[PDB]
Design a protein around this ligand. Structure first.
Ligand SMILES: *[C@@H]1O[C@H](CO)[C@@H](O[C@@H]2O[C@H](CO)[C@@H](O)[C@H](O)[C@H]2NC(C)=O)[C@H](O)[C@H]1NC(C)=O
Ligand SMILES: *[C@@H]1O[C@H](CO)[C@@H](O[C@@H]2O[C@H](CO)[C@@H](O)[C@H](O)[C@H]2NC(C)=O)[C@H](O)[C@H]1NC(C)=O
Ligand SMILES: *[C@@H]1O[C@H](CO)[C@@H](O[C@@H]2O[C@H](CO)[C@@H](O)[C@H](O)[C@H]2NC(C)=O)[C@H](O)[C@H]1NC(C)=O
Ligand SMILES: *[C@@H]1O[C@H](CO)[C@@H](O[C@@H]2O[C@H](CO)[C@@H](O)[C@H](O)[C@H]2NC(C)=O)[C@H](O)[C@H]1NC(C)=O
Ligand SMILES: *[C@@H]1O[C@H](CO)[C@@H](O[C@@H]2O[C@H](CO)[C@@H](O)[C@H](O)[C@H]2NC(C)=O)[C@H](O)[C@H]1NC(C)=O
Ligand SMILES: *[C@@H]1O[C@H](CO)[C@@H](O)[C@H](O)[C@H]1NC(C)=O
Lengths: 50, 170, 106
């Protein structure tokens, strides 16, 4: 299929109307970030020549 | 297409697999980069049919209905001004969908300010949003409201100068 | 930068060769339409909100904080006066209460 970018949401814009929240959600989200890699050492003489 | 050359190339091992894997990683990385930059909203916002923004003109940045590509005049100018085993893979996001993402971001930031980036899009009049932005940089709301026509004229002039500068500089 | 929504705090968690951030953010919800005005015209003077916004539920005008609906009476402490009513486009007429008025009245 052709991918849908998202759901259409026509915001009801007018020159004298505002939308004010009456409630809130305390949302906890996860962010995973890699920090380090495996520390690998290669003996060049031993790898090439044994 | 040489079988003998491939047979001799197999003596060198998995070099070809490494190079193909690296190029595949770069190719998926480009699509990931485009997703990270442009696909930051999951709602496709649209501008109202009446462009009554308290004097602010966004025609040079909003999409042009007359163009088949559905691009803005600035975006159309930007696209006009940029000119043996190798294949070029198409990007995952085409130019019209990237333009649609930019249009959704523009509609969200015009009709809702910064509310759509932090949650649901809350409508606010654009002069009031500009007044909020003025308060953000430490200027009182009255300065924006009293000089609203001047600020709108300066903004329109600056946007036009941006289009002229892009069209006039190689 | 620190989660989707208005960032409140974050908590770090160790992970194999990595870190996991639990971003605690504030998300607005259950929004409601209100009629808004840039300024309030009272006694030939224009009043602008100090930190909030003017909202109307249909018959009465209030000033509330931008990120939560908390209507309060438009007084002289929550607003500031700059100029008359002839310059601001869209200014509406509403009364502005004075806290000092019952004191000298009594
Ligand atoms: C604020 O009012 C507008 C219009 O008065 C509402 O927008 C309508 O919402 C309904 C419900 O989904 C849609 O079917 C209409 O098409 C919308 N009209 C327009 C012009 O956008 C809006 O929902 C109201 N906001 C809230 C929070 O109730
Ligand atoms: C704001 O939202 C919270 C939930 O996010 C509402 O709390 C719920 O209230 C109903 C009835 O009042 C209860 O049955 C639920 O158990 C409550 N949920 C939680 C998690 O406490 C709260 O009432 C809402 N407030 C307003 C003013 O709309
Ligand atoms: C917003 O700006 C556009 C262009 O920046 C205005 O369109 C111009 O309109 C005049 C007369 O209406 C024409 O002579 C020009 O040729 C138009 N320019 C272009 C590029 O089409 C537009 O009128 C402005 N105002 C609104 C409300 O859209
Ligand atoms: C807008 O809000 C005000 C204040 O909350 C409302 O005024 C009150 O309405 C209740 C409901 O009948 C009355 O019992 C109170 O006596 C009213 N207070 C005052 C000071 O008059 C007002 O009704 C709301 N308007 C709408 C259209 O909802
Ligand atoms: C808000 O109040 C002012 C003054 O009370 C109104 O201005 C008057 O408008 C009438 C009708 O145009 C004129 O005849 C008067 O000379 C005006 N007086 C002043 C002092 O300007 C204004 O019209 C009111 N606005 C609304 C929306 O009711
Ligand atoms: C908003 O638009 C209406 C027409 O749709 C107009 O009558 C009114 O004066 C406008 N208000 C402002 C503040 O621009």
């Amino acid at each position: 299929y052709t991918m849908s970018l998202g759901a259409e949401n026509s915001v009801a814009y007018s020159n004298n109307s505002i939308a004010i929240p009456i409630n809130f959600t305390i949302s906890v989200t996860t962010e995973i970030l890699p920090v380090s890699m495996t520390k690998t050492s290669v003996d060049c003489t031993m790898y090439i020549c044994g | 297409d040489s079988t003998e050359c491939s047979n001799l190339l197999l003596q060198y091992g998995s070099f070809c697999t490494q190079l193909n894997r690296a190029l595949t990683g770069i190719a998926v990385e480009q699509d990931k980069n485009t997703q990270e930059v442009f696909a930051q909203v999951k709602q496709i916002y649209k501008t109202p049919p009446i462009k009554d923004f308290g004097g602010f003109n966004f025609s040079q940045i909003l999409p042009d209905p007359s163009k088949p590509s559905k691009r803005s005049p600035i975006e159309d100018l930007l696209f006009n001004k940029v000119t043996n085993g190798l294949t070029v893979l198409p990007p995952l996001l085409t130019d019209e969908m990237i333009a649609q993402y930019t249009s959704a971001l523009l509609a969200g930031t015009i009709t809702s300010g910064w509310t759509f980036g932090a949650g649901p899009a809350l409508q606010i009049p654009f002069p009031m949003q500009m007044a909020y932005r003025f308060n953000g940089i430490g200027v009182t709301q009255n300065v924006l409201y009293e000089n609203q026509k001047l600020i709108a004229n300066q903004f329109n002039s600056a946007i036009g100068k941006i289009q002229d500068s892009l069209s006039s500089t190689p | 930068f620190c989660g989707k929504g208005y960032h409140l705090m974050s908590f770090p968690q160790s992970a194999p060769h990595g870190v996991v951030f639990l971003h605690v953010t504030y998300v607005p919800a259950q929004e409601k339409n209100f009629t808004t005005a840039p300024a309030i015209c009272h006694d030939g003077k224009a009043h602008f909100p100090r930190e909030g916004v003017f909202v109307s539920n249909g018959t009465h005008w209030f000033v509330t904080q931008r990120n939560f609906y908390e209507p309060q009476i438009i007084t002289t402490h929550n607003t500031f006066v700059s100029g008359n009513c002839d310059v601001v486009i869209g200014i509406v007429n509403n009364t502005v209460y004075d806290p000092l008025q019952p004191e000298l009245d009594s």
